[PDB]
Design a protein around this ligand. Structure first.
Ligand SMILES: O=[N+]([O-])c1cccs1
Length: 162
């Protein structure tokens, strides 16, 4: 297991534009295209991202290329965020994957309300952090995925992903 295999499990792979769990146009391995309800706007974003006229469809190689960029950008973002970097750097590599997973799904803005969880993670109070993480819109809206990510934060193992 690694971050790519983990997010591949959580996000799936679809080669045609689909709506994510929040109803937003997405493609590939959870590549958010736009929050716009206009499918044409999503298609424009897709063509811009891939560099050709896709007509709402991409290849597996193209999906994987976006995924690489997205994972990379998530990490680089975390490192530029003054609230996140100290916590991220305090973690072992497995728990860092859980951090990347959460940011990939929710964005840095999504993690803004997680101040108390973040402190508990930095303190390595793993069971307490796990309890706090579940008191969230995130957990309520995507409980099976959040449970996997939280188990990863709690244990620093890949037990939830087998
Ligand atoms: O950067 N971090 O240690 C993070 C943990 C959870 C969301 S981001």
């Amino acid at each position: 297991m690694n971050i790519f295999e983990m997010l591949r499990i959580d996000e799936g792979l679809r080669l045609k534009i689909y709506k994510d769990t929040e109803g937003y146009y997405t493609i590939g391995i959870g590549h958010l295209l736009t929050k716009s309800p206009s499918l044409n706007a999503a298609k424009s974003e897709l063509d811009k991202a891939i560099g050709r006229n896709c007509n709402g469809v991409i290849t597996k190689d193209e999906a994987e290329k976006l995924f690489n960029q997205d994972v990379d950008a998530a990490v680089r973002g975390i490192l530029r965020n003054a609230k996140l970097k100290p916590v991220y750097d305090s973690l072992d590599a497995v728990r860092r994957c859980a951090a990347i997973n959460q940011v990939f799904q929710m964005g840095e803005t999504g993690v803004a309300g997680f101040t108390n969880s973040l402190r508990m993670l930095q303190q390595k109070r793993w069971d307490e952090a796990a309890v706090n993480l579940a008191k969230s819109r995130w957990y309520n809206q995507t409980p099976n995925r959040a449970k996997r990510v939280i188990t990863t934060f709690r244990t620093g193992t890949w037990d939830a992903y087998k």
